[PDB]
Enzyme design. Structure first.
Site, PDB file in Angstrom:
ATOM      1  N   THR A 153      19.110  27.320 -32.067  1.00 34.97           N
ATOM      2  CA  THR A 153      20.419  26.770 -31.805  1.00 34.97           C
ATOM      3  C   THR A 153      20.878  25.965 -32.997  1.00 34.97           C
ATOM      4  OG1 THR A 153      20.509  26.875 -29.374  1.00 34.97           O
ATOM      5  CG2 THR A 153      21.698  25.104 -30.346  1.00 34.97           C
TER       6      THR A 153
ATOM      7  N   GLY B   3      12.328  36.109 -28.615  1.00 36.14           N
ATOM      8  CA  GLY B   3      11.368  37.004 -29.253  1.00 36.14           C
ATOM      9  C   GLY B   3      10.276  37.400 -28.274  1.00 36.14           C
TER      10      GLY B   3
ATOM     11  N   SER C 178      11.784  29.623 -27.561  1.00 35.65           N
ATOM     12  CA  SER C 178      12.636  28.510 -27.200  1.00 35.65           C
ATOM     13  C   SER C 178      12.114  27.226 -27.810  1.00 35.65           C
ATOM     14  CB  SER C 178      12.705  28.369 -25.687  1.00 35.65           C
ATOM     15  OG  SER C 178      13.145  29.585 -25.084  1.00 35.65           O
ATOM     16  N   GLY C 179      13.028  26.460 -28.389  1.00 32.73           N
ATOM     17  CA  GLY C 179      12.710  25.201 -29.034  1.00 32.73           C
ATOM     18  C   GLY C 179      12.304  25.268 -30.494  1.00 32.73           C
TER      19      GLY C 179
ATOM     20  N   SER D 146      14.572  26.856 -21.744  1.00 34.89           N
ATOM     21  CA  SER D 146      14.589  28.215 -22.277  1.00 34.89           C
ATOM     22  C   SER D 146      15.833  29.047 -21.918  1.00 34.89           C
ATOM     23  CB  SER D 146      13.359  28.959 -21.768  1.00 34.89           C
ATOM     24  OG  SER D 146      13.304  30.260 -22.299  1.00 34.89           O
ATOM     25  N   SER D 147      16.449  29.649 -22.921  1.00 33.15           N
ATOM     26  CA  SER D 147      17.537  30.585 -22.699  1.00 33.15           C
ATOM     27  C   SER D 147      17.026  31.940 -22.207  1.00 33.15           C
ATOM     28  CB  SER D 147      18.327  30.775 -23.982  1.00 33.15           C
ATOM     29  OG  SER D 147      18.594  29.538 -24.605  1.00 33.15           O
TER      30      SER D 147
ATOM     31  N   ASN E 110       8.234  26.023 -21.201  1.00 32.62           N
ATOM     32  CA  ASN E 110       9.385  25.481 -21.915  1.00 32.62           C
ATOM     33  C   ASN E 110      10.368  24.836 -20.985  1.00 32.62           C
ATOM     34  OD1 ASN E 110      11.440  25.146 -24.043  1.00 32.62           O
ATOM     35  ND2 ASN E 110      10.220  26.747 -25.079  1.00 32.62           N
TER      36      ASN E 110
ATOM     37  N   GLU F 256       7.874  37.289 -25.688  1.00 35.31           N
ATOM     38  CA  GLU F 256       7.269  36.376 -24.730  1.00 35.31           C
ATOM     39  C   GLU F 256       5.906  36.956 -24.414  1.00 35.31           C
ATOM     40  OE1 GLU F 256       9.162  34.260 -20.742  1.00 35.31           O
ATOM     41  OE2 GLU F 256       9.890  33.894 -22.778  1.00 35.31           O
TER      42      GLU F 256
HETATM   43  N1  LIG Z   1      16.557  21.876 -39.061  1.00 35.97           N
HETATM   44  C1  LIG Z   1      16.274  20.909 -38.208  1.00 35.97           C
HETATM   45  N2  LIG Z   1      16.343  19.612 -38.646  1.00 35.97           N
HETATM   46  C2  LIG Z   1      16.055  18.575 -37.758  1.00 35.97           C
HETATM   47  N3  LIG Z   1      15.717  18.829 -36.441  1.00 35.97           N
HETATM   48  C3  LIG Z   1      15.649  20.107 -36.014  1.00 35.97           C
HETATM   49  C4  LIG Z   1      15.921  21.162 -36.885  1.00 35.97           C
HETATM   50  N4  LIG Z   1      15.758  22.298 -36.184  1.00 35.97           N
HETATM   51  C5  LIG Z   1      15.410  21.994 -34.907  1.00 35.97           C
HETATM   52  N5  LIG Z   1      15.335  20.633 -34.793  1.00 35.97           N
HETATM   53  C6  LIG Z   1      14.952  19.859 -33.590  1.00 35.97           C
HETATM   54  O1  LIG Z   1      14.359  20.717 -32.628  1.00 35.97           O
HETATM   55  C7  LIG Z   1      14.992  20.598 -31.364  1.00 35.97           C
HETATM   56  C8  LIG Z   1      15.203  21.957 -30.733  1.00 35.97           C
HETATM   57  O2  LIG Z   1      16.300  22.483 -31.390  1.00 35.97           O
HETATM   58  P1  LIG Z   1      17.075  23.801 -30.894  1.00 35.97           P
HETATM   59  O3  LIG Z   1      17.963  24.356 -32.028  1.00 35.97           O
HETATM   60  O4  LIG Z   1      17.820  23.453 -29.680  1.00 35.97           O
HETATM   61  O5  LIG Z   1      15.956  24.891 -30.591  1.00 35.97           O
HETATM   62  P2  LIG Z   1      16.406  26.158 -29.741  1.00 35.97           P
HETATM   63  O6  LIG Z   1      17.838  26.057 -29.401  1.00 35.97           O
HETATM   64  O7  LIG Z   1      15.846  27.511 -30.290  1.00 35.97           O
HETATM   65  O8  LIG Z   1      15.823  26.137 -28.326  1.00 35.97           O
HETATM   66  C9  LIG Z   1      16.311  19.883 -31.590  1.00 35.97           C
HETATM   67  O9  LIG Z   1      16.562  18.943 -30.593  1.00 35.97           O
HETATM   68  C10 LIG Z   1      16.121  19.182 -32.899  1.00 35.97           C
HETATM   69  O10 LIG Z   1      15.803  17.866 -32.573  1.00 35.97           O
END
Ligand SMILES: Nc1ncnc2c1ncn2[C@@H]1O[C@H](COP(=O)(O)OP(=O)(O)O)[C@@H](O)[C@H]1O
Lengths: 145, 750
Positions: free
Chosen positions: B166, B432, B161-162, B213-214, B210, B434
């Protein structure tokens, strides 16, 4: 090894390198002399004979001609021509003797016992045309004499 | 041999995991210590572990470092991958890199100008392997293989997560949207992305590691017509953490939406719901972590509600959801009091239960009866105190699961297309491996799923290797397949860990301790993927794909129970003040068996596609812009299959030059005569002389396949030559110029 006439010719050159007036030189200068007297040691070859001195003593330890001499000897009793021509044949991507200027400076300033760009400048001074090419053969003979 | 003076290596380092070193003297065989030089100069004598006599890993030569694809590297091992990804990330702001068919994506934490229209076009209609790695490149390949094979595509985006899973999806869509035709009133992208706040409130939670986390797999299917154009989408959920609805462990919350409801309690429209703060309700207080630093749960509700509005959940139905969730919350506080003959009853006129029944619109007494009673079929019978509680939680969980499915069905209605659909590309957003310090059922489930997924992937890669090996006419029986079915089986076969757990559950007397012993009896020693802590009888170890994981049996049985009393559901199905509450509903069910079901359902879906792989990675723990923590990174790789996938790759022939490429970089090693009119044939002659052992490579139609460490060796001898040639010229110039300096100073020029 060496006779009296040779000992005077060498001690004459040796006192030119004394920038203090003590009859001695710096451990670092030992390399200079040897080259001045017709030799061509690799900085490694030089270091072995000095004792592989640490940097704290490479800029401070002085030596009379008596102690310098065995070192000048040691390099004497370890030093072909064809293999010099084959070495430049390495860096040659054409076959015409003509090698790039940029690609010769580069390797000489970022490989082996790396040399300063200034040293590399004074040597290749004018030995290059407009295209940035240099017939190594011309250059190889020059540097040897 | 290969460990000569001046050659470098990686040694361990508490700070940066690995650190560079240079060999001061040539390694002599049987020697006990190496002589090395670090980041502050020559200092240290590295001691070789006497039992293995093994040597530290070797560093790749610079000309292979910074490449677009890790498998290009000769010495392919943990530090190599770790360094190589660091320099690209830090020294060239490059976040995307391939590991074979996999795209590694390192979260930059800084917005980049690499996602606009101009860059989209540049990737449009190119081949993957002729353009710098990008999420866009992986999209294009999917859209390509779609038509070129009349086959739907799955892009599988994994990572902690993070890590940015997404965000990766968000850009793979935009690609697909821009490179298709575009639909007018659809602009599908925007609708789907408005879904995110919803799904994040009912599907994501704060955990010990986290904040967001989803605890489920999302699968957005992108629908395409016969003329390949974006028409609609279709969300599929899987693997939901049902346990989390009634249990939390220290420093963890229940799903967000509950907290976006308590913080919105003193609001007017939410007064019938009758909510205190989060320490009030049993199903939100257990962790002790009511608030997430830097989030206004109330403003997130505002955004949540707003997104519902955008997808067409009518304000009426919105109150429908919140009302059900309020009841789940009040339901939780229903206390039970033990009475004669191991039975129970609800205290007289119970505040929590009254509010539960008021909101749902069901007879107080009919429900109170059935919370404490059971239909043994047709004689009524009481239930113990503990059985009433299990059944209350079973019902809280059942309701949520359905309300969760309801929201997805109606989000879908907003993302559905009238136009018929030819094909789709689905993006999976999943977790992935944990692995905390304390591992429980929740983790066990996650890594179980990940073993299913890393099995498809293993296969996929194996088929592509075959194909490529055939295209070049190389013996196809030189590819060892690493089979992770035994582990899957330990977990999901009969007499396996989930099956024994499901048995011990329907034992009346059963406990975590007896289930632990049943696991030992059945498996300890009989199977090498299972172990036991030396000083515990309450914990096991499974050796999964990437690493080993010690689970703790405490909690497993209660989390796994999920038996809902048919009577309690009928009481709710028979409501006349709530249009939604009936709409939800249409030996011994269990969270583990359920998980398994959904898991298989998912692997089907995914096996009716050709999958693509993006592994996301978080590089540091404080949201820092382009900052790479080696400790975090290496953790993140291991629990991502990467280092293991690579561990496999390096067993075969991972290096692959064309004869033209080999020839260029190695014309200089060849004796001028050896060269021939046939350049392919020339390479065959030279490489048999330079590298002896002929099991160290294979010759193919258009390419040479090398074993690991071999190209490195070419690049050492090539380095050795050019170095020895330079030292020659150098010592000469050093002399020429010293004598010129003499000749001047001899004639008093100073
Ligand atoms: N390619 C990217 N370019 C700029 N910022 C990114 C990028 N990828 C992730 N981030 C940053 O990381 C943070 C987490 O993104 P996110 O896609 O929500 O991770 P996840 O959904 O797996 O938990 C976002 O708020 C964004 O600010």
């Amino acid at each position: 090894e060496f006779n009296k006439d040779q000992l005077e010719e060498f001690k004459e050159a040796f006192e030119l390198f004394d920038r203090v007036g003590d009859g001695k030189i710096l451990y670092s200068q030992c390399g200079d002399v040897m080259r001045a007297l017709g030799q061509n040691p690799t900085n490694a070859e030089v270091l072995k004979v000095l004792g592989n001195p640490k940097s704290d003593e490479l800029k401070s330890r002085r030596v009379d001609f008596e102690t310098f001499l065995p070192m000048l000897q040691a390099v004497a009793k370890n030093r072909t021509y064809e293999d010099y021509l084959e070495g430049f044949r390495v860096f040659d991507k054409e076959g015409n003797g003509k090698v790039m200027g940029a690609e010769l400076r580069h390797v000489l300033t970022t490989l082996g016992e790396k040399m300063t760009e200034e040293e590399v400048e004074t040597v290749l001074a004018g030995h290059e045309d407009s295209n940035g090419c240099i017939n190594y053969e011309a250059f190889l003979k020059h540097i040897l004499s | 041999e290969l460990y000569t003076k001046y050659a470098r290596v990686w040694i361990p380092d508490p700070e940066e995991v690995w650190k560079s070193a240079e060999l001061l003297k040539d390694y002599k065989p049987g020697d006990k210590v190496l002589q090395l030089r670090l980041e502050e100069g020559k200092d240290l004598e590295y001691c070789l572990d006497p039992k293995t006599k093994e040597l530290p890993p070797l560093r790749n030569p610079d000309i292979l470092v910074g490449e677009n694809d890790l498998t290009a590297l000769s010495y392919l091992h943990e530090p190599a991958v770790l360094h190589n990804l660091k320099v690209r990330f830090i020294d060239s702001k490059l976040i995307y890199t391939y590991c074979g068919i996999v795209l590694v994506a390192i979260n930059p934490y800084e917005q980049l100008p690499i996602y606009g229209e101009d860059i989209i076009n540049a990737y449009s209609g190119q081949n993957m392997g002729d353009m710098d790695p990008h999420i866009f490149a992986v999209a294009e390949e999917a859209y390509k293989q779609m038509a070129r094979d009349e086959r739907n595509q799955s892009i599988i985006v994994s990572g902690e997560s993070g890590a940015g899973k997404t965000v990766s999806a968000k850009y793979a869509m935009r690609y697909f949207a821009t490179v298709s035709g575009s639909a007018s009133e659809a602009n599908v992208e925007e609708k789907v992305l408005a879904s995110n706040p919803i799904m994040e409130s009912i599907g994501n939670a704060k955990t010990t590691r986290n904040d967001n986390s989803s605890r489920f797999g999302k699968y957005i299917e992108i629908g395409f017509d016969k003329r390949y154009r974006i028409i609609g989408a279709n969300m599929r959920t899987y693997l939901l953490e049902k346990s989390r609805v009634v249990f939390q462990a220290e420093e963890e919350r229940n799903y967000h939406i509950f907290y976006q409801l308590c913080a919105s309690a003193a609001l007017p429209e939410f007064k019938t719901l009758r909510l205190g703060n989060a320490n009030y309700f049993h199903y939100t207080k257990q962790g002790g972590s009511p608030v997430i630093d830097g989030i206004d749960d109330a403003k997130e509700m505002v955004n949540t509600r707003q997104a519902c509005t955008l997808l067409g959940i009518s304000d009426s139905y919105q109150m429908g959801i919140f009302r059900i969730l309020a009841g789940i919350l009040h339901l939780g506080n229903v206390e039970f009091a033990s009475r004669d003959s191991d039975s129970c009853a609800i205290p007289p006129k119970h505040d929590p239960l009254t509010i539960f029944c008021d909101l749902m619109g069901v007879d107080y007494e009919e429900m109170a009866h059935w919370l404490c009673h059971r239909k043994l079929a047709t004689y009524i019978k009481p239930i113990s105190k503990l059985h009433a509680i299990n059944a209350r939680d079973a019902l809280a969980k059942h309701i949520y699961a359905n309300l969760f499915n309801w929201i997805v069905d109606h989000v879908n209605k907003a993302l559905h297309s009238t136009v018929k659909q030819h094909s789709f590309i689905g993006v999976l957003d999943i977790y992935g491996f944990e692995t905390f310090e304390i591992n429980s059922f929740e983790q066990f489930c996650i890594n179980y799923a990940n073993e299913k997924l890393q099995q498809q992937f293993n296969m996929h890669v194996f088929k592509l290797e075959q194909e490529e090996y055939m295209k070049e006419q190389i013996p196809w029986t030189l590819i060892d397949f690493y089979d992770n079915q035994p582990c899957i089986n330990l977990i999901e076969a009969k007499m396996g860990v989930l099956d024994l757990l499901d048995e011990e559950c329907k034992m009346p007397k059963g406990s975590d301790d007896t289930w632990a012993q049943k696991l030992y009896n059945t498996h300890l020693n009989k199977c090498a993927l299972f172990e036991k802590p030396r000083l515990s009888n309450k914990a096991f170890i499974i050796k999964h794909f990437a690493d080993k994981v010690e689970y703790q049996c405490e909690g497993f049985l209660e989390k796994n129970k999920d038996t809902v009393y048919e009577e309690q559901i009928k009481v709710l199905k028979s409501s006349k003040k709530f249009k939604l509450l009936p709409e939800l509903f249409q030996h011994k069910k269990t969270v583990g068996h359920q998980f398994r079901n959904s898991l298989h359902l998912l692997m089907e879906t995914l096996n009716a596609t050709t999958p693509h792989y993006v592994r996301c990675i978080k590089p540091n723990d404080f949201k820092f812009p382009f900052t790479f923590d080696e400790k975090r990174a290496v953790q993140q790789l291991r629990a991502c299959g990467v280092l293991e996938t690579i561990r496999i790759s390096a067993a075969g022939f991972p290096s692959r030059w064309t004869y033209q490429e080999f020839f260029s970089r190695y014309r200089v090693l060849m004796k001028q005569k050896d060269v021939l009119s046939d350049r392919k044939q020339t390479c065959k002659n030279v490489l048999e002389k330079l590298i002896l052992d002929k099991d160290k490579y294979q010759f193919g139609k258009t390419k040479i396949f090398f074993r690991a460490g071999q190209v490195a060796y070419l690049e050492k001898i090539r380095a050795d030559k050019l170095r020895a040639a330079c030292i020659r010229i150098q010592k000469t110039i050093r002399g020429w110029l010293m004598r010129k300096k003499y000749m001047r100073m001899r004639r008093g020029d100073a």
